[PDB]
Amino acid sequence: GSVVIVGRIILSGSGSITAYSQQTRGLLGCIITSLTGRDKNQVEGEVQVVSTATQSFLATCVNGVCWTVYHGAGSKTLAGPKGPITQMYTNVDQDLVGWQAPPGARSLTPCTCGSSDLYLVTRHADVIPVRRRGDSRGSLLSPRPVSYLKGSSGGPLLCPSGHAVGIFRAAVCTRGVAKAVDFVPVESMETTMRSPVFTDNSSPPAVPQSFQVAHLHAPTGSGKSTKVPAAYAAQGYKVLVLNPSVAATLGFGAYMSKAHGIDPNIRTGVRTITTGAPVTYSTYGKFLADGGCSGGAYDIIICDECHSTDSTTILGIGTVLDQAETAGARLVVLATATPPGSVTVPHPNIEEVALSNTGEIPFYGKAIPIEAIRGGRHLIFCHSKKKCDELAAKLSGLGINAVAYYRGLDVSVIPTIGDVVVVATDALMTGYTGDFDSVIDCNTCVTQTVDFSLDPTFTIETTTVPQDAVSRSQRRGRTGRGRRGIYRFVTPGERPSGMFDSSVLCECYDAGCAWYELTPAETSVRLRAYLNTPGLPVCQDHLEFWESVFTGLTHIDAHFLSQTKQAGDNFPYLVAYQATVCARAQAPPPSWDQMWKCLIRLKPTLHGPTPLLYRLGAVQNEVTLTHPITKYIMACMSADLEVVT
Amino acid sequence: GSVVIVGRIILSGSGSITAYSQQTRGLLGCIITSLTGRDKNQVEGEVQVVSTATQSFLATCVNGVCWTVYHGAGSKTLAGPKGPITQMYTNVDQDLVGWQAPPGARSLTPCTCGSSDLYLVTRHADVIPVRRRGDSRGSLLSPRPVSYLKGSSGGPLLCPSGHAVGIFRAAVCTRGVAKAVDFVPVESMETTMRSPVFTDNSSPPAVPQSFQVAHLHAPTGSGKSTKVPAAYAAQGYKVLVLNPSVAATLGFGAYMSKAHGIDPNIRTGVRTITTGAPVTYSTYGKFLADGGCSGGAYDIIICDECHSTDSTTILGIGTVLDQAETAGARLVVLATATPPGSVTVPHPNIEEVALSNTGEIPFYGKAIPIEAIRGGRHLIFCHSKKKCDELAAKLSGLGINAVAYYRGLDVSVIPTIGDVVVVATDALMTGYTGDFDSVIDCNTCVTQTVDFSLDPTFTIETTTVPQDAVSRSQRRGRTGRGRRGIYRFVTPGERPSGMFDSSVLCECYDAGCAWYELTPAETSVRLRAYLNTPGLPVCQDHLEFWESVFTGLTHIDAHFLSQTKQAGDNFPYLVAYQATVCARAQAPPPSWDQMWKCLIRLKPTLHGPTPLLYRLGAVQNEVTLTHPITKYIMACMSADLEVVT
Numbered sequence A, B: 001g002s003v004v005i006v007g008r009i010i011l012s013g014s015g016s017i018t019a020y021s022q023q024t025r026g027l028l029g030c031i032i033t034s035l036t037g038r039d040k041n042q043v044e045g046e047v048q049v050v051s052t053a054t055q056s057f058l059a060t061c062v063n064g065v066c067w068t069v070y071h072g073a074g075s076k077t078l079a080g081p082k083g084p085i086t087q088m089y090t091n092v093d094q095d096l097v098g099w100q101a102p103p104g105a106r107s108l109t110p111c112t113c114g115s116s117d118l119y120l121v122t123r124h125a126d127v128i129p130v131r132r133r134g135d136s137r138g139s140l141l142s143p144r145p146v147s148y149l150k151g152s153s154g155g156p157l158l159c160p161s162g163h164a165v166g167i168f169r170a171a172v173c174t175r176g177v178a179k180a181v182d183f184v185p186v187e188s189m190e191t192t193m194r195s196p197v198f199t200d201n202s203s204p205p206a207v208p209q210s211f212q213v214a215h216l217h218a219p220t221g222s223g224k225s226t227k228v229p230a231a232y233a234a235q236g237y238k239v240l241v242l243n244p245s246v247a248a249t250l251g252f253g254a255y256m257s258k259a260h261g262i263d264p265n266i267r268t269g270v271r272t273i274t275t276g277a278p279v280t281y282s283t284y285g286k287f288l289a290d291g292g293c294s295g296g297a298y299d300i301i302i303c304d305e306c307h308s309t310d311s312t313t314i315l316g317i318g319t320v321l322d323q324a325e326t327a328g329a330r331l332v333v334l335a336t337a338t339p340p341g342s343v344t345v346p347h348p349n350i351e352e353v354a355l356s357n358t359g360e361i362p363f364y365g366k367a368i369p370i371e372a373i374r375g376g377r378h379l380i381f382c383h384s385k386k387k388c389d390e391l392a393a394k395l396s397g398l399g400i401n402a403v404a405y406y407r408g409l410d411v412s413v414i415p416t417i418g419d420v421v422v423v424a425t426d427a428l429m430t431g432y433t434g435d436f437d438s439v440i441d442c443n444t445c446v447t448q449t450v451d452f453s454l455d456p457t458f459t460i461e462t463t464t465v466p467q468d469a470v471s472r473s474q475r476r477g478r479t480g481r482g483r484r485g486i487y488r489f490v491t492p493g494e495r496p497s498g499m500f501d502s503s504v505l506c507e508c509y510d511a512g513c514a515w516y517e518l519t520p521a522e523t524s525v526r527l528r529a530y531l532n533t534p535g536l537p538v539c540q541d542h543l544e545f546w547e548s549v550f551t552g553l554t555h556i557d558a559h560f561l562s563q564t565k566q567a568g569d570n571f572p573y574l575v576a577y578q579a580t581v582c583a584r585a586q587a588p589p590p591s592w593d594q595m596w597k598c599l600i601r602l603k604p605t606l607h608g609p610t611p612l613l614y615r616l617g618a619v620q621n622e623v624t625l626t627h628p629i630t631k632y633i634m635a636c637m638s639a640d641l642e643v644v645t
C-alpha cells in the first residue's frame, strides 16, 4: 500500500526556529487512503508527517520534490489526489527517495552558507540544536536515548535562517545513547535530480579498456547466467561466473555444453572439473576457499545473483572487488534480476494466482487444491526445513511424488525429469532452473538480526518475517524459465529490497575466521570494498565494531571449531568460542540445545553458571558476566555505532 | 476499536491432537473492521484468531460463549454481522471476557477427565505438551523463550480427549524463559456465567454488624465524596475519607461546612486541621505517614477514588484492607465512578465536542479556538508539567488569565473565583471540583513500565501513551459537576481500564522504605491485602520478587536519601541507593542528569565505570557489573516471574 500524509510540522517564519504539529487524519483514513492510494486532502507546508501501515516518519520538500528515507519508505508510492504517486527518485545508496511534491506543498530552500549551527526538527515538533561536523554529520549538544529520535527520519536539519541543510537518516550512538546524527545532505538531492531516472542495465556491459565495475539487470530466465558468459567467451574472453547456488552451478555444468557449445570448468564442494574451457562457474564459497582471485586468470568476473546477501556472497563479492583489478581482470559484472530498490513487476511468462481458503492442503493460512500439483512439475517454498519435511510427507501420503530439499541435503535428491513436487527452502530460491510448471510461495522467510541488548553484549536473533521484493521475484522466477509458468501465493505484499542487517557482517568475520583463514583486518578490507561499491545491497557500516570484536577472540579451541564447522550450523566461530571459554572454566554452555553439542562429552564435569559472551539462542543456565572476554566485548561496544531512526 | 476475527485454528476430532490455521483477513478488514465494528464474515470452528489494530491473540468457544483474556481484549466489543457485539461477560479479576458465540461457531466440551497431561494450542497452530500442576498452573515439558508464547493468550489447553481445561493467559518465566503456563480454568468460565449480569453498587452500603468491604460506584459529581460521608455522619458514624488528591482534600473543608454543616478534620502533607468533627478527609499519603489505621478511631473508612493506581493509593488502600477490622472499623467502602472494566459512557451534564484543526492555539496535533476559552473557567489537561508551562505562557500570551497547576505547585495558584484557564497534569484529574465550564483533554498520559531487561537487571521506563478509560472519564468529570459542562477532546479512543504495571509495585516498596518506615516484608503484607481483594484494579503478582530486591538494599546513605526525597523525583530510594553504591565505590553515577544531582558535590572525586544496579534512565557512563549488589539483584531475577501473553 501507499505511504500516506497524516499530518505536518509547521515551521516558524520569523526569529528563533520553533515548530508545532498538525494531525490531519486518524488511523481509519490512513489505511483506507493507503489502499486507494487516493488522498483528496489539501497538502500544506514543507514538512509532512507520513505513515505506512506499520511505521511513521517525516518527509521534507526541497526543490519541488518531497524527500524521505529509503529505509522508511522503500519504493512505495505516495497517496495522491489522482491516486498513487510513484517515486521520481529512488537512491538506495544515499538512503534517499523522492516524490514530486503534491500541489499545496511548499519547498524549503537549500542552505548555502556553511553555517555549522544546525537545528533538527523531530516528529514531535521539537527543535534540537546540532553542531555540524562534516558533510553529513553533526553532533548533538545534549545526548538522548535513540528511542527519542525514532520516527524523525526524513525530518529537516535547518540553518539558523530556516534553510535546509539535509534530512535526518540515522543516529550515532554509544550503548543506546545518541550523540550525533547522520543526514542526507541537500547536495545529494541536487545530484540525484540531475541524474537519469531510468537506468536500463539490461544489456551485457561492454568490455572496457581499463578496469570497470558494471551492472547487469534483466528479468529471471533471460540468460544472465548462461547466454551472457557464453557470448563473452565466444568473443575471446576468459570468464569466471560466481553464483551463490550449488544446485544452479551444477546445473550450468550439465546445461552449457548442449545449450551454448561450451563445456565449462566447474568449482564446488561436491564437484570440481577442469575442462580448460574459457568459462568457469564457481560458488562464492569455493571461490573463497581457493583463495580468491588468481593473477591473470580471467578477463571478466561475473558476480552473479548479486542480490544474495548471505554472508558467503557478501564476502565473496567484496573479495572480487578488492582483488579483481590487481589480478588483471578488465571487467567485473554485478548481475541480478532484482537490484536494490526494485519491486516485483509482471513477468511475461508468469501468470499469478492467489491461493484462497479452498483446497485440500493447508498452506500458511491458505490452502492448496490438490489438482494444482497433481500432475506436472512444481516447486513449493516453505520458510523452514521442518515445514518442508512435513509438507513433503503429507503430499507423499496423498500419492503425490514429493521431495524435500534444503541446506545439507544433496542436489541429487531432486529428480531432473518426470512429475514431482519439490518442497524447498530458499536453498532453491536463486539461480536454479528445475523445469517447474509452477511455484507456490509461502511469502515468508527466516532472517537474522543483531540486537545490541547489553545483556551483557549483543544478541543474534532469528525470526520469520514477510518476504522482501528480492525473495518474491526470485522465488517466482523459479518458474516461467523459457516457457509459460504459474505463480501461486499466500499473501500479495512485499518488504522493500536491497538492505541487509549488521548480523551478516558479524557472519562474515565469523566465516573469515572459521573457514577462510582471514584475519579480522583482512575481512574488513574485503567488506570495505563491498560497502564502497555503489548499486549493491546496503547495510549499516559496523565494520570497525565487528573487527574489534573478533580481533579479541583469540585462542579458540581448534577441536570445538572443527566440530562446529562440521555440524554446519550458524556462527561456527562464535559458538566454538563460547564453548571454548566454557570448557576452560568447567562451566556449562548457555543451554543444552543442539547448538552446544560439541560440549556434550564434558557435561558431567561442567558446573555453575555460564560465562556468557553474547546471546546466540535462549539461555537457560545461570550466567556470570565478568569473564575477561565478556568485558572486552563490552568495551568494544563503547565505539560509535550508527543505527537508523 | 472492536476485536476482529482474522482467522481460526482448526483442531482434529480424533486421535492425537493436531491443529492448523486458516486466515480470513489481512489488515484489509482487520484494522478497518476493528474501527467500523462490522464483520459479515461467517464464523466457523472453536478456536478464533482475533485481533485489534495493535495486537493479535486467540479466543476459545466454550459453552456457547467466545472467551478470551481481559488483558488483550479489555471491554472491547467483537465485530459482528450487524455491528459491534457487546461483551456478555467481563471478569477483570479472572482476566476473562466473553461474547455470545457468533452463529457458525462450535464450542469445546469442558474437561472432567481429571487428566494431568494437557496440550496447549498456540497461535501458530502448534500443539505443545503441558503437565497440570495446579488448578490454573501447568509446566511445559520443554521450556521455550517467552516470545514464542506471545500472541497465544486466549488459546485452549486441552486434555487428551480434546476437551477444554481452560484458556492460556500468562507464562511463568526464569530470565525470559517460560517453564510453566498460567491459565483460566473452565470452572472460572462456569462461575462467571452463573454470576449476576449486573450488580447495582450505586447506593451507600449499610453498616454491617461484623466487618465488611463494600463497593460504591456512581457517576462523577454524584456526591460520593461529600453527600455520602455527610449522610453516614448524620447516622452517628465516625467516617474517614481517603482521597488521592491534595487539591480535592483541601477543598472538602470549606465546602462541607457550607453545604453540609460539617467542619471536617483535614489531613494533608501541606496542611492539617483538627476540629474534632466525626468526619475526616485525608490524602492516602498523609494516612500512610500517620501510621495507618488508629485503633477504634473510625466506624467507616472510605477508600475514595479507588480507581487510582498511583503507588500511594495502592499502598494506602492495601493498608486499610489489612488493618481496618483490627482497628475496629465495621465498614470499608471502595468508591469510584470508574471501576475496573468500565468504559466511558455519556454523562448527563456533559456535552462532548471533538477539537478540529481550526483554531489559533495548537494543541496535541489539533487546535483550540480562542473563543472557547476566552473567557469563563476552563481546565486543560496536558501530559507534562513542561507542556503545562508552555501552554500557560502561550495563553498569556493572548491575554488569557492562565496558570499551570501540577505537583510541586501550591494549590493556592488556582483562583477559586473568576475567569481562568488552568493548565494541569493529572494532579487535577480525580476528586477535584473547580467550577469549570469546560475541560479540554489532550487524551494522553505518562506511564512507567518495568522491563526485565537483564542488562544487568531491570529497567524502569517512562513513556507517553493514549489515555485509558479511567483517565478519560475522570478528566472529563472535572466539568459537569452540579451543572452543565463541555468536554473537548483531541481523539475519540480509550485504552482498557483496571490494570496497572509491576513498576507500581516497585514504587510501593520504594515509598515504604523511603517515606513510611515500612520494611519490605511490611509492605508485602499490605500489598497482599490489596491483591486479594476482588473488584480492584489488577496487577501481575510480583510481590515476592520486589520484596526480595528491596530486602537486599541495606545501609543506604541517609543524607542521599534525604536529598532524593526532598527533590521529589520518581524512585527516591532506588536513586539514593545507586548513589550510595557509587559514592562508596568512588565511581560516577550513570549520568550527570538531574536525577543524580545529589552526587554533584563529589563529582571531582568520582572516576571509572558506574557500578550499575538497574536502569532508571539513560546511562551515559561506561558501566561495570562487578558490584555485589548488582549480583544480588541478578540473583533475585532468577525467581519465577509470571508475565502475560
Ligand SMILES: Nc1ncnc2c1ncn2[C@@H]1O[C@H](COP(=O)(O)OP(=O)(O)O)[C@@H](O)[C@H]1O
Pocket (backbone or CB within 6 Å): A218, A219, A220, A221, A222, A223, A224, A225, A226, A227, A251, A252, A255, A337, A431, A433, A480, A481, A482, A483
Ligand atoms: N539447467 C538448465 N536446464 C534447462 N534449461 C536451462 C538450464 N539453465 C538455463 N536454462 C534455460 O536458459 C534460460 C536462461 O537461464 P539463466 O541464464 O539461468 O537465466 P537468468 O540467469 O537470466 O535467470 C532459462 O530461461 C532456461 O530457459
Ligand SMILES: Nc1ncnc2c1ncn2[C@@H]1O[C@H](COP(=O)(O)OP(=O)(O)O)[C@@H](O)[C@H]1O
Pocket (backbone or CB within 6 Å): B218, B219, B220, B221, B222, B223, B224, B225, B226, B227, B251, B252, B255, B431, B433, B480, B481, B482, B483
Ligand atoms: N469544593 C467544592 N466546591 C463547590 N461545589 C462542590 C465542591 N465539592 C463538591 N461540590 C458539589 O457537590 C457535588 C458532588 O461532589 P462530589 O461529592 O465531589 O462528587 P463525586 O465524589 O461523586 O465525584 C458536585 O457535583 C458539586 O455540585
Ligand code: BEF
Pocket (backbone or CB within 6 Å): A218, A219, A220, A221, A222, A224, A225, A305, A336, A337, A430, A431, A432, A477
Ligand atoms: F535471474 Be535468473 F533467475 F538468475
Ligand code: BEF
Pocket (backbone or CB within 6 Å): B218, B219, B220, B221, B222, B224, B225, B305, B336, B337, B430, B431, B432, B477
Ligand atoms: F466521581 Be467524583 F468526580 F469523585
Ligand SMILES: [Mg+2]
Pocket (backbone or CB within 6 Å): A224, A225, A304, A305, A431
Ligand atoms: Mg541467473
Ligand SMILES: [Mg+2]
Pocket (backbone or CB within 6 Å): B224, B225, B304, B305, B431
Ligand atoms: Mg469524589
